[PDB]
Each structure stands twice: as structure tokens, then as C-alpha cells.
Symmetry: C3
């Protein structure tokens, strides 16, 4: 009933494509403390490529990394082409989701002044040079909650331009370890980014 | 606000068992940002095993790791099996604590739908309760605030079962380094977890 | 919103001294969720020592680390002697700043009970033993948002005593890598600390 938490469900049914359709349950919770967004996120791949990682028999790089994209329009609606199905992605209602799909959700989108879409011109003066890293959180999650099973995790904001998105949260994942029969089950990751809002 | 912050005191007197009774000050602050909980946490061992770590003379594993449990009931009261003494664990009032002990504190407990108590072992076709990792935050703290002194730190939610707990915040700590005369003084760690609600009315 | 979020601008003009004057844009956002402060922070060095790090030709330590201080008075005003210029450091209003400079900002300062001014200890009684680490967050940021480019990052609270400061947020940065032509462009870092104010 609180309008201040866009999320999946806390315990979601398969609602995310990783390597196929409905590959994986992605738990993502955006709580809007002031002008910033507090977010935790776990990923669990239940079937397909990364449901039981083995790089002993699959040493290839395509088997040692993947990416999850959330694509949003100017209203901040989740698009098709997002890795995340939008059926069970809405504002909170007890442990579940609100009856109607959400019309507007800009307050929750990354700031397009803080995290601008990169531009396609070559010239750039000292003060007018924009940043790639600014739009980035690089960290680790840990498969199975084992500290010896690190995945390099890269949250990116308004990185994507897919399906004519205006805002884009992107979780990239990669590892060096040659994991043997290790389900991709990520530890919860806490992070924040600066939001947008607009009047009318 | 004061009613939105369960914690110890900012500067607590020895209030945590690590290897023996009140042998460490644990600073923990739960602030309830919407449906999530924002938390920072430092640990300082003042006496006993880990008050001055040396693995040169104590190479044994029992001397290179330990765990601190907070056990809660369905109301969210701290239970006896807890590593943390409950005298100075309550809602905030200035840099101190509220007059009466707290009756209810569920809003602050980890979500038992997101972090369910029981774990399923063996088979995994559905795999629907099958996340161990979801209930986990793995990171590092740094003894003395020195970047060369990492402790592998594992926050767990509703992991524990002891004393008939319903909710359980659990901080495990372990290290590979052979530390020589290094007090266990952890750098403050920021983290969040998904909370619980309170029925309807 | 106003009074709830002390910050720079989301996209700041050069407003930070690192090795010389206004040689870097530092983006810092303090949002006061309850009794804690939520903060993200990116640093971008546009000119001078760290604008294009090379430790192949500059192996010296002075070229492999630096520190950024914010020094505050009892009111919580940013002082000269801070690395951060105070012109465009104020309470939020849209993507910009409030008209007048801010009179009071204690609610945003680190807790002087949790992070005491104490640093010299003459005795050390078991129950009255004070903590250095408590005042510390040690983590990593990642230059260019590349996971292979770690900087050891140390946030410290009420560490500093310079210019007779009462409160002090301090970001130290250091690296072991011998980086070749690597701009100091940090990935956004999320963190929190304890903060109070009270009076009549
Ligand atoms: C950083 C962290 O938290 N975990 C790390 C663990 C633990 O420190 C501990 O050694 C496990 O027992 O060590 C590694 O496996 C290692 O040294 O190769 C890297 C891993 O990232
Ligand atoms: C905060 C952090 O990650 N610190 C890490 C440092 C940094 O790389 C630092 O710059 C140089 O010590 O490296 C280690 O000391 C190391 O390799 O053994 C481990 C430690 O966890
Ligand atoms: C986010 C993270 O973990 N970064 C770390 C990377 C990643 O493992 C990366 O994927 C491989 O470059 O490893 C190091 O570069 C390394 O091994 O020396 C240290 C660095 O801090």
C-alpha cells in the first residue's frame, strides 16, 4: 500500500530471462529514501546455461559471464527487450504486487543528468568531458553465499539504448574461477543511485 | 525519527559475547528506509581470544574465524541464545535508549518470505525455496581500518534455528592472513535487507 | 527535496582540489534516511597529477595515492582547507541548488559519539576501550568502471582536525597496480554513517 517501493515480489516465480525465457528468479527491490534509490538484488538461475555452471567442460567465455537488462521509457515503464518480465514487477502490496499495472514510475529511474546517455560526437573540452565510471557500480556477489565463489558484478545506469529506452538499469556478471557444478545463486547486493523526478 | 531506529547505543559498553561473556562491544544500527532496512555495524573485541589476534602462535582454524548471532521471536524480541546482551538494545532516544524495553519490533526483522527460515536439501526440480545465497551478504571488513587487514564478512538472515528463533541476523567472520598482534577492530559495514510488515490492522 | 539532501550538483563543474585547484569534479549526494546518512560518491580528475595516471614513468608513492577532505564547523558549514569548493555545495532544488547558502547542516554530520574526535589514547581500560575502525569504511572503487582497475577507498568520519574542524568526511584513495594511462574516473560508491542533531 506504500507507493515508495517498486520491486519484483520478495519471493518471485520465474520472471527473468538470462540465457532463455523464464530462466531465473530475479529479486530486485527499489526503496526511494529521499532523492536517492536504495536497492538490494539477488539472482537465482533455475534452468539453462547457468543453472549449474561448469567451466571444466565449458571453458568458453560465453559460459563465464552474462548480463541482465531492465529497459524503461520516458514514463519509466518496463519494456519488452528487458530481461525481466513486467507481470510481477510493480509497486508493493504486502508480500505481493498491486492489482493494476503502474502508469508512471520516473521517481525511481536513474538521474539522466548524473547518468546521461553517452553522445556520438568526438570533440570534448576540459570541463565538458563526461564520465563512463560515474554511471557504474563495480563490486562482487558470491555464489551460494560462499566467500570463495566471487562474481564481478557491474550495475550500470542509462547505459543501454535498446528498444529506444530512456532509462536502463543493467547488471553485468563475470568470473575468472573455473567453477565445477556451481548453480548461479547470488548473495543479496545492497546499492544506491541518484533518482530523477519531473512536475505536472 | 527515534521510533524508526532499533540499535545498540552509538558508543556501547561491552554488550556482546564472541568467545566469552561481554568480551566485545558490537555497534549495530537498523534504520527503516521504507520496506527495506539500512544498517551499519562495527565489532570491537576488548578481551579474550580475538582481542589481540596472533595466528603465528595460534595457527588453528578456531583462532582464524568466529560468528555472532542475534536470535528473535515472532514479536521480534531478542532471545537468550543471542551473542548480544539485550539491556542496551532498543529504539533510539538521543545518543541513548528509550525508557521501557520494546514490546514489538517485527517491522525491523528480515522478510521470512524473501529469507525463509527452513532450507530445502537434496532434490531441486521446482527450486522455489532453493536459494541459500539470497539470505546472504558476503563482503569484507578491514581490521583497524587498514586495507591490508581483510576479514571475509557474511551477514545471514533467518539462518539460525537456536532457542526456537523465528528471525536471526548472523555475522560470520573469517580470514586467511596469519595476523600478528592484530586486535579484531572491524571497519563499519553498510548493508540493507528486505523487512517484514505488521498484519493489516 | 530541500533540507533532506545536501550534495554537489548531479553534474558538477570543477569543484574539487586533488593535487591543484579545481582539477577534478567530485559528485557527492547525502540523503538523510532517518538517523543514518545514505551517500553515493564519484570522483573524476580532469587535469593535473591523476588526470591520466601512469606509474610506469612515475613509480613514486605520491603518484599512487591521494586524499580528499571535507572539513565542517559546529554548524556543519564546509570550511576553506576542504578539498571541495563550497560555491555549488548546498541543499537540492531540482537538478540544481537552493538560492541562499545554507546556515545549519548538523543533521548531516557524522555522530561524534559513534565517531568521536578521540585519536590520542593515554590509558585503555577494558570497558572504556575506544575504536579506530568504527570511524572507517574500507572498500574499493574501480577506475573507468573496469573491474580490473581497483582503488582501495577509505571513508573516515571526524578523522581530521585541520582548520579547527568539528566534523570531517575524508575519502583516502590508494592502489598497488602500476596503471598505464588510466584517468582517475571512479565508479559510484554507496555507503551510510550514523548522524544526529537536537536542540530547542
Ligand atoms: C574477497 C572475499 O570476500 N572473498 C575472497 C576469498 C576469501 O577472502 C577467503 O579466502 C575464502 O576462504 O578469498 C579468495 O577466494 C582468494 O583469496 O582467492 C577470493 C575471494 O574474493
Ligand atoms: C579494500 C581492499 O580491497 N583492500 C585489499 C588490498 C588493496 O588492493 C590495497 O590497495 C593494497 O593492499 O589488497 C590486499 O591487501 C591484498 O592483495 O592482499 C587485500 C585487501 O582486501
Ligand atoms: C570487482 C573486482 O572483484 N575487482 C577485482 C578484479 C576482478 O576479479 C576482475 O573480474 C578481474 O580483473 O580482480 C583483481 O583485478 C585481481 O585479481 O587482481 C582485483 C580487483 O579488485
Amino acid at each position: 500500500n506504500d507507493k515508495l517501493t517498486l520491486w519484483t515480489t520478495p519471493d518471485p516465480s520465474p520472471n527473468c530471462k538470462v540465457s532463455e525465457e523464464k530462466d531465473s528468479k530475479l529479486t530486485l527491490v527499489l526503496t526511494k529514501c529521499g532523492s536517492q534509490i536504495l536497492a538490494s538484488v539477488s539472482l537465482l538461475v533455475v534452468k539453462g546455461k547457468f543453472a549449474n555452471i561448469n567451466n571444466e567442460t565449458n571453458p568458453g567465455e560465453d559460459y563465464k559471464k552474462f548480463s541482465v537488462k531492465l529497459l524503461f521509457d520516458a514514463n519509466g515503464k518496463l519494456l519488452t527487450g528487458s530481461s525481466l518480465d513486467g507481470n510481477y514487477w510493480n509497486y508493493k502490496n504486502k508480500d505481493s504486487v498491486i492489482g493494476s499495472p503502474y502508469e508512471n514510475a520516473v521517481p525511481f529511474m536513474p538521474n539522466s543528468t548524473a547518468y546521461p546517455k553517452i553522445i556520438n560526437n568526438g570533440t570534448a573540452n576540459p570541463e565538458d568531458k563526461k564520465s563512463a565510471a560515474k554511471k557504474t557500480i563495480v563490486t562482487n556477489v558470491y555464489l551460494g553465499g560462499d566467500a570463495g565463489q566471487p562474481v564481478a558484478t557491474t550495475v550500470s545506469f542509462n547505459k543501454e539504448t535498446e528498444s529506444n529506452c530512456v532509462y536502463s538499469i543493467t547488471f553485468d556478471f563475470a568470473w575468472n574461477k573455473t567453477y565445477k557444478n556451481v548453480p548461479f545463486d547470488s548473495s543479496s547486493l545492497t546499492f544506491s543511485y541518484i533518482a530523477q523526478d519531473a512536475e505536472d
